[PDB]
Design a binder for these strands. Structure first.
Lengths: 65, 69
DNA sequence: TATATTGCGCAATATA
DNA sequence: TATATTGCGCAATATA
């Protein structure tokens, strides 16, 4: 029923709502992808810190010898 | 929209390709969500280890500085 | 030549 | 009444 002016307005508003809904869904998907990058970097940083602390513990303990 | 047989064949092939591409993208999203769960559990393990070792080092440093010269 | 990926429209459906 | 979400599809673009 493309000719009705009420139809044209309804499609106009739904197209706006559809694009808004899909935009939000895309941002949620990107946020999840970004969380993977953040956690990967943070886990690498924490592993480096584990290794640094272990080196410092071993150096300090060598003062016993 | 042509509407030749060549056009109908091209639309059919693209429609199949679109569904296959969307299925793959949705599966990637599911894998990414699982990856977040795996990395969060690993992050919690690493935070606990860093805290444990930091306390151990702090206590050992305190012991050594209680020594006289 | 082809398939893969993408933003979008439509209408049905879900929800307020 | 309204906006929000989604299966199906289209055509432009990206890629092989």
């Amino acid at each position: 029923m493309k000719h009705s002016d009420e139809y044209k307005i309804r499609r106009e508003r739904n197209n706006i709502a559809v694009r808004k809904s899909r935009d939000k869904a895309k941002m949620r998907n990107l946020e999840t992808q970004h969380k993977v990058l953040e956690l990967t970097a943070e886990n690498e940083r924490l592993q480096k810190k584990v290794e640094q602390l272990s080196r410092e513990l071993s150096t300090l303990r060598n003062l016993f010898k």
